[PDB]
Write an enzyme that holds these catalytic residues in place. Structure first.
Site, PDB file in Angstrom:
ATOM      1  N   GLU C  71       0.868  -1.168   0.000  1.00 45.33           N
ATOM      2  CA  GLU C  71       0.000   0.000   0.000  1.00 45.33           C
ATOM      3  C   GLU C  71       0.909   1.224   0.000  1.00 45.33           C
ATOM      4  O   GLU C  71       1.853   1.267   0.800  1.00 45.33           O
ATOM      5  CB  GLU C  71      -0.920   0.012   1.227  1.00 45.33           C
ATOM      6  N   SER C 140       2.527  -7.661  12.293  1.00 44.38           N
ATOM      7  CA  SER C 140       1.392  -7.705  13.199  1.00 44.38           C
ATOM      8  C   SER C 140       0.423  -8.796  12.774  1.00 44.38           C
ATOM      9  O   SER C 140       0.102  -8.940  11.592  1.00 44.38           O
ATOM     10  CB  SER C 140       0.657  -6.363  13.237  1.00 44.38           C
ATOM     11  N   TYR C 224      -0.212   5.831  18.738  1.00 47.65           N
ATOM     12  CA  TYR C 224       0.702   4.754  18.374  1.00 47.65           C
ATOM     13  C   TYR C 224       2.159   5.184  18.446  1.00 47.65           C
ATOM     14  O   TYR C 224       3.043   4.320  18.476  1.00 47.65           O
ATOM     15  CB  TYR C 224       0.399   4.240  16.959  1.00 47.65           C
ATOM     16  N   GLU C 254      21.887 -16.406  20.972  1.00 49.02           N
ATOM     17  CA  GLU C 254      21.756 -16.792  22.373  1.00 49.02           C
ATOM     18  C   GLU C 254      20.299 -16.816  22.820  1.00 49.02           C
ATOM     19  O   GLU C 254      19.921 -17.646  23.661  1.00 49.02           O
ATOM     20  CB  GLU C 254      22.563 -15.831  23.251  1.00 49.02           C
TER      21      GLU C 254
HETATM   22  N1  GTP Z   1       1.797  -0.913  18.302  1.00 50.02           N
HETATM   23  C1  GTP Z   1       1.367  -0.516  17.110  1.00 50.02           C
HETATM   24  N2  GTP Z   1       0.379  -1.220  16.454  1.00 50.02           N
HETATM   25  C2  GTP Z   1      -0.060  -0.812  15.239  1.00 50.02           C
HETATM   26  C3  GTP Z   1       0.476   0.319  14.647  1.00 50.02           C
HETATM   27  N3  GTP Z   1      -0.138   0.493  13.459  1.00 50.02           N
HETATM   28  C4  GTP Z   1      -1.045  -0.494  13.285  1.00 50.02           C
HETATM   29  N4  GTP Z   1      -1.013  -1.305  14.385  1.00 50.02           N
HETATM   30  C5  GTP Z   1      -1.824  -2.514  14.617  1.00 50.02           C
HETATM   31  O1  GTP Z   1      -1.795  -3.360  13.483  1.00 50.02           O
HETATM   32  C6  GTP Z   1      -2.958  -4.163  13.465  1.00 50.02           C
HETATM   33  C7  GTP Z   1      -3.448  -4.418  12.044  1.00 50.02           C
HETATM   34  O2  GTP Z   1      -2.435  -4.265  11.074  1.00 50.02           O
HETATM   35  P1  GTP Z   1      -2.660  -3.205   9.885  1.00 50.02           P
HETATM   36  O3  GTP Z   1      -2.728  -1.804  10.439  1.00 50.02           O
HETATM   37  O4  GTP Z   1      -3.928  -3.543   9.142  1.00 50.02           O
HETATM   38  O5  GTP Z   1      -1.389  -3.351   8.910  1.00 50.02           O
HETATM   39  P2  GTP Z   1      -1.190  -4.603   7.916  1.00 50.02           P
HETATM   40  O6  GTP Z   1      -0.689  -5.818   8.657  1.00 50.02           O
HETATM   41  O7  GTP Z   1      -0.228  -4.211   6.825  1.00 50.02           O
HETATM   42  O8  GTP Z   1      -2.619  -4.882   7.233  1.00 50.02           O
HETATM   43  P3  GTP Z   1      -3.008  -4.234   5.813  1.00 50.02           P
HETATM   44  O9  GTP Z   1      -2.942  -2.728   5.893  1.00 50.02           O
HETATM   45  O10 GTP Z   1      -4.401  -4.669   5.434  1.00 50.02           O
HETATM   46  O11 GTP Z   1      -2.031  -4.725   4.775  1.00 50.02           O
HETATM   47  C8  GTP Z   1      -4.008  -3.423  14.276  1.00 50.02           C
HETATM   48  O12 GTP Z   1      -4.498  -4.231  15.320  1.00 50.02           O
HETATM   49  C9  GTP Z   1      -3.298  -2.208  14.831  1.00 50.02           C
HETATM   50  O13 GTP Z   1      -3.599  -1.991  16.187  1.00 50.02           O
HETATM   51  C10 GTP Z   1       1.469   1.030  15.305  1.00 50.02           C
HETATM   52  O14 GTP Z   1       1.960   2.035  14.801  1.00 50.02           O
HETATM   53  N5  GTP Z   1       1.911   0.608  16.537  1.00 50.02           N
HETATM   54 MG    MG Z   2      -1.903  -1.207   5.262  1.00 53.53          MG
END
Ligand code: GTP
Ligand code: MG
Ligand code: TA1
Ligand code: GDP
Ligand code: ADP
Ligand code: MG
Lengths: 429, 365, 441
Positions: C71, C140, C224, C254
């Site tokens: 994206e 994630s 975030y 390790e």
């Molecule tokens: N800790 C943290 N979590 C994040 C952040 N941005 C997104 N998330 C978490 O990422 C999870 C989902 O992932 P997405 O934001 O959809 O990113 P992705 O894995 O690339 O998914 P797509 O955009 O559909 O490709 C959510 O539960 C968010 O809470 C961040 O900057 N920090």
């Molecule tokens: Mg995305």
């Protein structure tokens, strides 16, 4: 670069589209001449989603204007933003559909659909990657219903793997604006369930109720209804053309909100909405935004969620705000209103956040719900439909255009099946 | 009056390559042990001596593999060495006897890709399948009943491809003109089908060959000739008396023969592009069918069975709804390389044994 | 001489990477344009270590990183940001369309046509590495890209590079808070396809970090950015041993040796004890014993579970700053006398200790105080079994209705695979139940 092709069908679709292009052009700093005069540099980096570049940094909407009555096209041309639309995208006939679905689907629309599809192919093949189409029209009228459904079917045939986004005005519960509204609405819904990815149901009486009760407007012309709808349409695709902490495109919303393929009729909403005088008495924060957002009185479809259960809701926020507040509020709403959410989906709320609010606001939110209460729409139409179909109240205007009674029966059966499916998922464990 | 949906299972033989690898390793493994006509064991124990030796000194500390086999019971099972005639005699000949008695019937094939469904139904010129045998025996029994009854066959043959209907016996008819419309009495009534009228074995087999030639089929690396569409053949048999004292005893029935495209696994496949899109549509159709099976089995979901999720389930609505004897031929590949998919094809089949329907003899005039 | 390649997958990975590389540049004196002004005082010195930054002839320092999100939005935020001149222009976008929170899209349909490019860039980046140790994958669970494309990338890396360490920093779904309704499917499928390829998966939860920011840092409204800064501090603590001198060094190989008893239970929790505001930095000593005690408090864990409902299999304490080994010894001895902290009988050793001289940095604009000593903890416990079971239950509640399943089969997936994944997850649960049982003889 995700791009959307926007199709406007009928009088209602054309008025909503004109107001929507006003709103979007103001959002990106595009003047009535098509030139840019905005301030932020973020307004250009995703201008391609709705606009094409022509010569002198002139931006032309990627819109296709369709009708069978020439008056709407002249009204659009003489408006404030009539000079930005491409002249060759004005596709129109001579005589309207006569508030007849068959005329706009088989007799009159069939003679004009080829030019519209030629323009659609020209616009769609001039993109690096087409995200999908969005169509604005009305059910309960001839040209909108017929041509919109015909175009949706043929575009789905040509483009089966792209999103289809129907913003449609459904028949209202108390007062009707056409005598033959149930026939057109039933046939339109029958064509929509098989050929759309997501439909945003709008009802005029809900918008009147919002304008009178919340905005305290005593003369809510169609300009104000179009204003509200246009705010919703801008809110839906906000993350496609601005950056954010947590993005969400059309396909993600469709994936998260459509548990089963045929249950893709949604109930939109927008917040904040306040009167001109009561704004100064209200602190604009996420707890207030979500409170107004989930209110039954703020929905745009004239269907009470409290008579059913939410299959899935989606909230798209705009503005600088914390993620903790959004998460905690979308959890508290589920916890407090657990009776209004299906228990076989553990988490019924999709969340998206964009960093760029609307021009004059510090914070905004768009609601898109998917609940079983929408059956109260279809059931009503079905009742009216059979009340007219038992006696053959107006069928000779449709069978005279080459339609068979089997089409009516199939549409009725399909709508009844949809109602039954919604009732099943309402009463389940 | 009740009638259960019967489930027969067929195990295809190994290919030449798979046979070579498995025979060398045994001297790769056969994972379906057909122990009785109504009973098989899936991934039986004590067929891997290294696993035996390892587990005999590894007292359930960790799993790393299956711990207990699966035990499956069906109406009839066919091993690798079965031929077409044995399948025909025990799967669809009673259905032809039923359709000539006055009761509707269907036989349809289900399974993973490359398991031998088109072989079972259509077959090859040197080894005819179910359709050839059924039509041959039908016309033979017609010649037997000549000068006692008047028997009329009407033949229709279509395919479902990317959720579009095509008439296999009348090409150039547009997909837009073939639509499914339920009338007031919930009859399927597909629009604009040829409805041919054969009057001999030669004519009907030539017609069916012409229909098969128009099916969509292309290589997909699971087999060089892979069906990419759900093919439906309908044979309407109508019986009149020759006495002239025409009464309500006039009879009419339908025999349906359906070949379904196979489920494509994602973890183990190399089909990219239009082939993958076709597989996606096939998988959607089979998921809708599975939802229909689950809804019909569960009493709690009797309020709504999702027939309209796909055109295949709508055309199969008549079979499971009422007034039809149903046979399902579940085709499997007995190898460890196809452990996963086969399991699903067995598991689904198990649920499908719990569907029951009501049969009513047809009368006319 | 030593180095590791960071891979940032998805929006979460990219934003965590932004935080991480900001922290690294501040630690090593790299300006956002990639120049190191410390050469103007000590010409030819080594303040920027080549564990993360490759040096060119002109003196520019290029991070050893790869960014992918399917994206254009998130990477385009980097290309026009303050660090546009730091990263090599090969920040990879196949964003003609995203995964749409769909495992199938990011693994089978759109995950292809980018995988070859990504592995080509990783190969080019590794060919410059004379002594590559391993990969740090940031992603994630619950997203489309972060689940599917990460699984595909791990599968391909396991073949291309073989026995090479692959540590994962993953955002686990929270028990209550979530931003999507299809997180269980994505998480379960990701775990099923990833167990056989990762060596150690460090896990954090957004809900737990929200609680930590609310309680310890007095931030009522964290974004975030704060979460990413804390995760960046944890990653810096883990990787400090490759960059700065210390009394006890810890290599990347390790962690897997010490924290992973058996191959399938490589899911440790991460926590960072001295999370404190500048105002509360006064009024406390912040000694080694106090910080080590704070590591074991359930409130300070960054995964929403309770260690008191399970048994500790392994613990790894990484100390930074003014830390003396005697104090660490006394602190761990004090911890071992607590009856509320149980350890499995098959591990009478329990603890690993690492000590580093370099204290953490202040990251201006941040929220953490300038503490002169700090501790990170990586603890493998059986309590994580609970965190698995909830997801499984959620998965079942959807899969019984086949809710949202058509979106997955519509992109080339077979239905049975869902079941197969769930079954692999059942075995995983049982493995935990078998691991935390008192032995007998
Ligand atoms: N800790 C943290 N979590 C994040 C952040 N941005 C997104 N998330 C978490 O990422 C999870 C989902 O992932 P997405 O934001 O959809 O990113 P992705 O894995 O690339 O998914 P797509 O955009 O559909 O490709 C959510 O539960 C968010 O809470 C961040 O900057 N920090
Ligand atoms: Mg995305
Ligand atoms: C204090 C102040 O500045 O005035 C506000 C205002 O008073 C209020 C009441 C505005 C005002 O809206 C209305 O009066 C209204 C009338 C009929 C139907 C809908 C709205 C406002 O007109 C609307 C206007 O909104 C915008 O400019 C948004 O960016 C909006 N723009 C347009 O719709 C637009 C219309 C014509 C031409 C160009 C743009 C928008 C909203 C969503 C997505 C994109 C754009 C704003 C801030 C105000 C006024 C001017 C009084 C409200 O407007 C919206 C939808 O945001 C109505 O309740 C909100 C909250 C505001 O407090
Ligand atoms: N929201 C909105 N709805 C409209 C507008 N004009 C007409 N409608 C609705 O559209 C329906 C009439 O259909 P119409 O488009 O006029 O028929 P057509 O011209 O033959 O396509 C009625 O139910 C109206 O409520 C408008 O400006 N805004
Ligand atoms: N019982 C069988 N005996 C001999 N060959 C078989 C048998 N079943 C399948 N085959 C072989 O498998 C190949 C492909 O099978 P096919 O039926 O086309 O797969 P599908 O069932 O997916 O259509 C055929 O060439 C056929 O020779
Ligand atoms: Mg076939």
């Amino acid at each position: 670069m995700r791009e959307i092709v926007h199709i406007q069908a009928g009088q209602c679709g054309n008025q909503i589209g004109a107001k929507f292009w006003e709103v979007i052009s103001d959002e990106h700093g595009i003047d009535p001449t098509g030139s840019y005069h905005g301030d932020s540099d973020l307004q250009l980096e995703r201008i391609n989603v709705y606009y094409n570049e022509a010569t002198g940094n002139k931006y032309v909407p990627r819109a296709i204007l369709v009708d069978l009555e020439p008056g709407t096209m002249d009204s659009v041309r003489s408006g404030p933003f009539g000079q930005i639309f491409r002249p060759d995208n004005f596709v129109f006939g001579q005589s309207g559909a006569g508030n007849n679905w068959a005329k706009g689907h088989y007799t009159e629309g069939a003679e004009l659909v080829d030019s519209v599809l030629d323009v659609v192919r020209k616009e769609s093949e001039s993109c690096d990657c087409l995200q999908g189409f969005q169509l604005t029209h009305s059910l309960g009228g001839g040209t909108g219903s017929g041509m919109g459904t015909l175009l949706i079917s043929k575009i789905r045939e040509e483009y089966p793997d792209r999103i289809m986004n129907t913003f449609s005005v459904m028949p209202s519960p108390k007062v009707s604006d056409t005598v033959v509204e149930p026939y057109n609405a039933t046939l339109s819904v029958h064509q929509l369930v098989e050929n759309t990815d997501e439909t945003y149901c709008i009802d005029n009486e809900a918008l009147y109720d919002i304008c009178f009760r919340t905005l305290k407007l005593t003369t809510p012309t169609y300009g104000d209804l179009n204003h509200l709808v246009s705010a919703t349409m801008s809110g839906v695709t906000t993350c496609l053309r601005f950056p954010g902490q947590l993005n969400a495109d059309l396909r993600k919303l469709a994936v998260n909100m459509v548990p089963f393929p045929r249950l893709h009729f949604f109930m939109p909403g927008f917040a904040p909405l306040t009167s001109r005088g009561s704004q100064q008495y209200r602190a604009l924060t996420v707890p207030e935004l979500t409170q107004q957002m989930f209110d039954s009185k703020n929905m745009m479809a004239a269907c009470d969620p409290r008579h059913g259960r939410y299959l899935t809701v989606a909230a798209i926020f705009r503005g600088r705000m914390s993620m903790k507040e959004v998460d905690e509020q979308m959890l508290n709403v589920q916890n407090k209103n657990s009776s209004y959410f299906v228990e076989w989906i553990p988490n019924n709320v999709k969340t998206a956040v964009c960093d760029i609010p609307p021009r004059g606001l510090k914070m905004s939110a768009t609601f898109i719900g998917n609940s079983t209460a929408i059956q109260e729409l279809f059931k009503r139409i079905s009742e009216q439909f059979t009340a007219m179909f038992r006696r053959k109240a107006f069928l000779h205007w449709y069978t005279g255009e080459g339609m068979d009674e089997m089409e009516f029966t199939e549409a009725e059966s399909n709508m009844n099946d949809l109602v039954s499916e919604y009732q099943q998922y309402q009463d389940a464990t | 009056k009740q009638s259960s949906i019967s489930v027969a299972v067929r195990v295809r033989p190994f290919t030449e390559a798979e046979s070579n690898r498995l025979v060398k390793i045994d001297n790769l493994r056969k994972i379906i042990n057909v122990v009785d006509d109504r009973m098989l064991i899936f991934d039986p124990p004590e067929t891997n001596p290294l696993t035996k030796m390892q587990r005999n000194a590894f007292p359930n500390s960790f799993k790393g593999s299956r711990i207990r086999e699966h035990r499956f019971v069906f109406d009839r099972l066919f091993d690798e060495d079965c031929t077409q005639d044995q399948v025909y005699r025990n799967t669809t000949q009673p259905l032809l006897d039923s359709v000539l008695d006055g009761y509707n019937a269907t036989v349809f094939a289900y399974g993973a890709t490359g398991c031998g469904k088109t072989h079972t139904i259509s077959g090859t010129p040197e080894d005819p399948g179910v359709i050839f045998l059924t039509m041959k025996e039908l016309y033979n029994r017609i010649e037997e009943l000549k000068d006692t009854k008047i028997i009329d066959i009407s033949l229709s043959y279509l395919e479902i491809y990317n959720e579009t209907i095509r008439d296999l016996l009348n090409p150039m008819t547009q997909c837009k003109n073939l639509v499914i419309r339920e009338d007031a009495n919930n009859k399927i009534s597909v629009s604009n089908l040829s409805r041919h009228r054969p009057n001999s074995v030669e004519e009907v087999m030539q017609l069916i060959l012409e229909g098969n030639k128009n099916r969509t089929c292309s290589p997909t690396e699971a087999n060089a000739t892979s069906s990419r569409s759900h093919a439906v053949l309908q044979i309407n048999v109508i019986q009149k008396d020759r006495t002239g004292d025409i009464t309500e005893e006039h009879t009419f029935a339908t025999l349906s023969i359906i070949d379904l495209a196979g489920s494509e696994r994602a973890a183990a496949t190399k089909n990219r592009g239009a082939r993958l899109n076709e597989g996606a549509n096939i998988n959607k159709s089979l998921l809708a069918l599975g939802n229909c099976i689950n809804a019909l089995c569960d009493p709690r979901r009797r309020n709504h069975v999702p027939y309209r999720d796909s055109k295949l389930t709508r055309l199969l609505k008549f079979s499971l709804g009422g007034n039809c004897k149903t046979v399902m031929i579940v085709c499997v590949s007995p190898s460890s390389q196809h452990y996963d998919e086969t399991l699903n094809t067995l598991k689904y089949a198990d649920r499908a044994k719990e569907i029951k329907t009501k049969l009513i003899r047809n009368q006319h005039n | 001489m030593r180095e590791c390649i960071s891979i940032h997958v998805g929006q979460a990975g990219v934003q965590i990477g932004n935080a991480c590389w900001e922290l690294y540049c501040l630690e090593h004196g790299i300006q956002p344009d990639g120049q190191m002004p410390s050469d103007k005082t000590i010409g030819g010195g080594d303040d920027s270590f080549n564990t993360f930054f490759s040096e060119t002839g002109a003196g520019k320092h290029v991070p050893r990183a790869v960014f992918v999100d399917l994206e254009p939005t998130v990477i385009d935020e980097v290309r026009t940001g303050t660090y546009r001149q730091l990263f090599h222009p090969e920040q990879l976008i196949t964003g003609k369309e995203d995964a749409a929170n769909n495992y199938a899209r990011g693994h089978y349909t759109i995950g292809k046509e980018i995988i070859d490019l990504v592995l080509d860039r990783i190969r080019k980046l590794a060919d410059q590495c004379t002594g590559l140790q391993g990969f740090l994958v940031f992603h994630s669970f619950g997203g489309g890209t972060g689940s599917g494309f990460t699984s595909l990338l791990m599968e391909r890396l396991s073949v291309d590079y073989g026995k090479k360490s692959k540590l994962e920093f993953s955002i686990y779904p929270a028990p209550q808070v979530s931003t999507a309704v299809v997180e269980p499917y994505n998480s379960i499928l990701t775990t099923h396809t990833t167990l056989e390829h990762s060596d150690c998966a460090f896990m954090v939860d957004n809900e737990a970090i929200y609680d930590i920011c609310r309680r310890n840092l007095d931030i009522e409204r964290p974004t975030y950015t704060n979460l990413n800064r804390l995760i960046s501090q944890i990653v810096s603590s883990i990787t400090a041993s490759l960059r700065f001198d210390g009394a006890l060094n810890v290599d990347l190989t390790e962690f897997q040796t010490n924290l992973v008893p058996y191959p399938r239970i490589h899911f440790p929790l991460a926590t960072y004890a001295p999370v404190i505001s500048a105002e509360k930095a006064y009024h406390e000593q912040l000694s080694v014993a106090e910080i080590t005690n704070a590591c074991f408090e359930p409130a300070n864990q960054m995964v929403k579970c309770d260690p008191r409902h399970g048994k500790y299999m392994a613990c790894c304490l990484l100390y930074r700053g003014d830390v003396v080994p005697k104090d660490v010894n006394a602190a761990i001895a004090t911890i071992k006398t607590k009856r509320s902290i149980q350890f499995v009988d098959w591990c009478p050793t329990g603890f690993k200790v690492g000590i580093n001289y370099q204290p953490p940095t202040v990251v201006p604009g941040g929220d953490l105080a300038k503490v002169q000593r700090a501790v990170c903890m990586l603890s493998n416990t059986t309590a994580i079994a609970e965190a698995w079971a909830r997801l499984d239950h959620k998965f079942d509640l959807m899969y019984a209705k086949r809710a949202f399943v058509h979106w997955y089969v519509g992109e080339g997936m077979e239905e049975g695979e869902f079941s197969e994944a769930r079954e692999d997850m059942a075995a995983l649960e049982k493995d935990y139940e078998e691991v935390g049982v008192d032995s007998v003889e």
